[PDB]
Amino acid sequence: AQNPNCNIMIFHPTKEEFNDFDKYIAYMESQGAHRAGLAKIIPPKEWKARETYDNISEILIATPLQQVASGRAGVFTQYHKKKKAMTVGEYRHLANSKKYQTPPHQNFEDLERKYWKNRIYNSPIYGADISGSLFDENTKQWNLGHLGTIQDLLEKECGVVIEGVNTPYLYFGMWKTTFAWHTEDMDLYSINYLHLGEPKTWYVVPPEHGQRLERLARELFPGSSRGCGAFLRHKVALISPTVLKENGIPFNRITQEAGEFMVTFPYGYHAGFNHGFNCAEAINFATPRWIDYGKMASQCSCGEARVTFSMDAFVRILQPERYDLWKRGQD
Ligand SMILES: O=C(O)CNC(=O)C(=O)O
Ligand SMILES: [Mg+2]
Ligand code: NI
Ligand SMILES: [Zn+2]
């Protein structure tokens, strides 16, 4: 069995190996990469996403979100308070202001210590889930707006044509902006490209151990768990590495830098934080191996998680028994 300890693997494809996305994903899996839940892919030195980032300041962040924490330093939830629209140029200046800027630090480990010690005491502002792309249309390899759609994958594997579309999203971050513990919708893959700026630290639990995380989360968030059998789908719960180690949960950590891709694998729980002002682009995707995970994915039917149009068909075709309950939660 490849990668039996479930370590995060890092890949350095050549330009020729970067031509066929599906083939390279399947290659990474042949080496055991999925067992970690997360892999890093460093593009060939010949490749670029676009020419420059000099012309992005006029992108609008229609609904910036202030991430307000409740709890204790290592175990907290966050809610998202809506703020007035601002441009990416305005958001960059905010991120670099004395109130929000990254503090002085020694290295990535010291910054991680500071994050876990102090996150709860501040409320950073996050631009999330903005439909769009920063890949040049003439970038032909690993262009996250030109991938095969998940609807076409389900049709190729199972024969059923379905409605829906699959497009990328932009994320504008600052110091302390946080992504809560979650798997992807319908336990899909994701791919994330860090276009510019400061790093992103990731934490991940191996798919084979995901239920261990879920059991800890039910213990640590007992009211949320009573509310919804799939409450991690609400994307609000944070648990620190120290707390995970105290409870014997298997996990790994890695820091993504500008110019690097990360891939999350089906049913790989992940969480993390941004080091400072940055811009990432991400999209969900599928492969033949995902279908069996999609059929088994939990679902939120309580009303909180509220998702994309395109999840309807995936539930309808892969989970017909759950469809009626799930849909009542969406209305
Ligand atoms: O960059 C982010 O906002 C965090 N992204 C993801 O959870 C992802 O790509 O799965
Ligand atoms: Mg612009
Ligand atoms: Ni994710
Ligand atoms: Zn729910």
- Planar angle of CA 135, 136, 141, nearest 5 degrees: 70
Query: Ligand 3: distance of its center to the CA of 131 in Å?
Result: 15
Tokens encoding 146:
């030109």
From the alpha carbon of 282, which atom of ligand 1 is closest? 9
Contacts of 169 (CB under 8 A, 6+ apart): 128, 129, 130, 131, 132, 281, 282, 283
* Order of all β-strands in the sheet with 75-82: 9-11, 38-41, 261-264, 189-197, 278-285, 169-173, 125-131, 65-72, 75-82, 237-239
DSSP-assigned letters across all residues of 88-147: HHHHHHHHTSTTTSPPP-SSHHHHHHHHHHHGGG---EEEEEEE---S-TT--SS-TTSS
Cβ proximity of 269 and 181 under 8 Å:
yes
CA distances from 217 to 3, 75, 226 (A): 26, 10, 12
Q: Whose CA is closest to 90, among 52, 61, 131?
A: 61
Ligand nearest to the CA of 130: 1
Asked if residues 267 and 187 have their Cβ atoms less than 8 Å apart, the reply is yes
What is the DSSP secondary structure assignment for residue 158, as one 8-state letter? Answer: H
Work out the end-to-end distance of the chain between its first and last CA atoms, rounded to an integer number of angstroms.
45
Long-range contacts of 77-80 (CB under 8 A, 24+ apart): 77/180, 77/221, 77/224, 77/236, 77/237, 77/238, 78/178, 78/180, 78/236, 78/238, 79/236, 80/126
Residues having C-beta closer than 5 Å to ion ligand 4? 228, 300, 302, 304
Ligand 2 centroid–CA 57 distance in Å is 4
Q: Which atom of ligand 1 is nearest to the CA of 264?
A: 10
SS3 of 254, please?
strand
What is the chain's length? 331
Query: What does the alpha-carbon distance between residue 270 and residue 278 come to, in Å, rounded to a whole number?
Result: 19
Residue type, 79: Y
Q: Which helix (H) or strand (E) is 85 found in, with range?
A: none
The tokens describing 274, both together, are 């941004």
| Single-letter code of the amino acid located at 159 | G
Write out the two tokens for 124: 């950073």
Solved with: X-ray
Task: Tell me, in angstroms, the distance from the centre of ligand 4 to residue 109's CA.
Answer: 34
- Gap between the Cα atoms of 180 and 32, Å rounded: 25
Greatest distance between any 2 Cα atoms in the chain: 55
Supply the residue whose CA is at minimum distance from atom 10 of ligand 1: 190
Q: Which ligand is nearest to the CA of 88?
A: 2
Structural domains of the chain sorted by starting position, each given as residue range(s) with its CATH number in brackets: 1-331 (2.60.120.650)
User: Which uninterrupted H or E stretch holds 306?
Assistant: none
Burial class (CB in 10 A: 0-12, 13-18, 19+), 203: buried
Q: What is the resolution of this structure in A?
A: 1.5
Counting ligands in written order, the one closest to the CA of 54 is 2
What b/e string do you get for 15-42 counting C-beta neighbours within 10 Å, with b at 16 or more? eeebeebeebbeebbeebbbbbbbbbbe
**Ramachandran class of 32: left when φ > 0, alpha when ψ lies in -120 to 50, beta otherwise:** left
Give me the residue label for tokens 């991690």: 232
Cα gap 16→8, rounded to integer Å:
23
d(C-alpha 66, C-alpha 83), whole Å: 7
Determine contact, residues 77/224, Cβ cutoff 8 Å. yes
